[PDB]
Design an enzyme around this catalytic site. Sequence first.
Site, PDB file in Angstrom:
ATOM      1  N   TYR B  28       0.804  -1.214   0.000  1.00 31.50           N
ATOM      2  CA  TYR B  28       0.000   0.000   0.000  1.00 31.50           C
ATOM      3  C   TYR B  28       0.835   1.260   0.000  1.00 31.50           C
ATOM      4  CZ  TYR B  28      -3.958  -2.943   0.790  1.00 31.50           C
ATOM      5  OH  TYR B  28      -4.939  -3.894   0.643  1.00 31.50           O
ATOM      6  N   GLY B  32      -2.186   3.291  -5.749  1.00 35.15           N
ATOM      7  CA  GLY B  32      -3.131   2.203  -5.581  1.00 35.15           C
ATOM      8  C   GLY B  32      -2.818   1.327  -4.394  1.00 35.15           C
ATOM      9  N   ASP B  49      -5.006   5.355   3.028  1.00 34.75           N
ATOM     10  CA  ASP B  49      -5.859   5.073   1.894  1.00 34.75           C
ATOM     11  C   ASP B  49      -7.333   5.045   2.279  1.00 34.75           C
ATOM     12  OD1 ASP B  49      -3.576   4.685   0.439  1.00 34.75           O
ATOM     13  OD2 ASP B  49      -3.884   2.561  -0.010  1.00 34.75           O
ATOM     14  N   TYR B  52      -8.414   8.528   3.085  1.00 28.91           N
ATOM     15  CA  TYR B  52      -8.748   9.396   1.947  1.00 28.91           C
ATOM     16  C   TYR B  52     -10.085   9.023   1.317  1.00 28.91           C
ATOM     17  CZ  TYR B  52      -4.515  12.170   1.663  1.00 28.91           C
ATOM     18  OH  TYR B  52      -3.493  13.066   1.863  1.00 28.91           O
ATOM     19  N   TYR B  73      -4.384  22.297   3.371  1.00 24.54           N
ATOM     20  CA  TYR B  73      -4.815  22.554   4.739  1.00 24.54           C
ATOM     21  C   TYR B  73      -3.780  23.348   5.525  1.00 24.54           C
ATOM     22  CZ  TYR B  73      -2.204  18.089   5.185  1.00 24.54           C
ATOM     23  OH  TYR B  73      -1.294  17.072   5.081  1.00 24.54           O
ATOM     24  N   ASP B  99      -3.484  12.657   7.287  1.00 23.22           N
ATOM     25  CA  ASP B  99      -2.042  12.735   7.076  1.00 23.22           C
ATOM     26  C   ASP B  99      -1.305  12.589   8.405  1.00 23.22           C
ATOM     27  OD1 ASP B  99      -2.075  15.076   4.213  1.00 23.22           O
ATOM     28  OD2 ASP B  99      -2.905  13.089   4.480  1.00 23.22           O
TER      29      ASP B  99
HETATM   30 CA   LIG Z   1      -1.829   3.498  -1.673  1.00 21.40          CA
END
Ligand SMILES: [Ca+2]
EC number: 3.1.1.4
Lengths: 124, 124
Positions: B28, B32, B49, B52, B73, B99
């Site tokens: 990961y 993707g 992931d 998001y 941000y 994040d």
């Molecule tokens: Ca990823």
Amino acid sequence: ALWQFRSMIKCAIPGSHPLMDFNNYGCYCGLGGSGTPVDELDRCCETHDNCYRDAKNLDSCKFLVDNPYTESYSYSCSNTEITCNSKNNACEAFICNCDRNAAICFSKAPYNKEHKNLDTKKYC
Amino acid sequence: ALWQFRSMIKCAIPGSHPLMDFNNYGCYCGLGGSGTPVDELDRCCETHDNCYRDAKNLDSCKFLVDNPYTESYSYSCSNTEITCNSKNNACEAFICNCDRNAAICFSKAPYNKEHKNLDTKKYC
Ligand SMILES: [Ca+2]
Ligand SMILES: CCCCCCCCCCCCCCCCOC[C@H](COCC(F)(F)F)OP(=O)(O)OC
Ligand SMILES: [Ca+2]
């Protein structure tokens, strides 16, 4: 490799912030890309995207079944000047050359702030 | 946005080379993400992931018509402490927290060399 490509950009454009400056510019600078480029800088990016597509097609890159951004190469920086090392075997050279060409292109093309962070959905 | 994530990683991890060490890690950490995460550090990436995705489905982010890396941000770093600024609007605050949670996570997750730049189509 991507971090290398970032290092390349710094080479040519000494005080740059490559992710901040070039990731999400126009229609083609940043992961993704479609539509008509919005300027020369944008065209720099579509060119790099194509190069990589070419890279993945190139016979020499056949054992490369990940992103070209995952392929390490050998390069060096001499005062704003980028060199892809003769060392590099054929796939790595092509990629290195892809990344080298883009940074120079970046370092030549105007950066139009207004083109940054485009609604790509509505304009690309 | 992406530049701010990099910085966050550099804040939480003084020695770090974020693009160089966390991009293209496991299944990961990178573009993707499918397969079974290989270790805790990968799970940090899987978690991000998932964060998001949560943000793309957030009512507070409904006008964010694009990917959260392109979303800027307000944040701060102090003594390895990343701060999501309280004046952030909700989408911004949401993205920011995805994040720092990932950046903090990287900092406490063990780094396994052998999970770097994996053959993903094979092992993920
Ligand atoms: Ca990823
Ligand atoms: C910000 C921290 C990243 C390093 C740790 C991240 C942990 C894993 C999360 C995934 C990271 C995102 C990876 C995707 C990067 C996309 O980057 C692709 C690139 C963005 O900028 C590249 C540039 F060359 F400009 F520097 O767009 P491109 O069109 O190819 O070039 C203009
Ligand atoms: Ca692109």
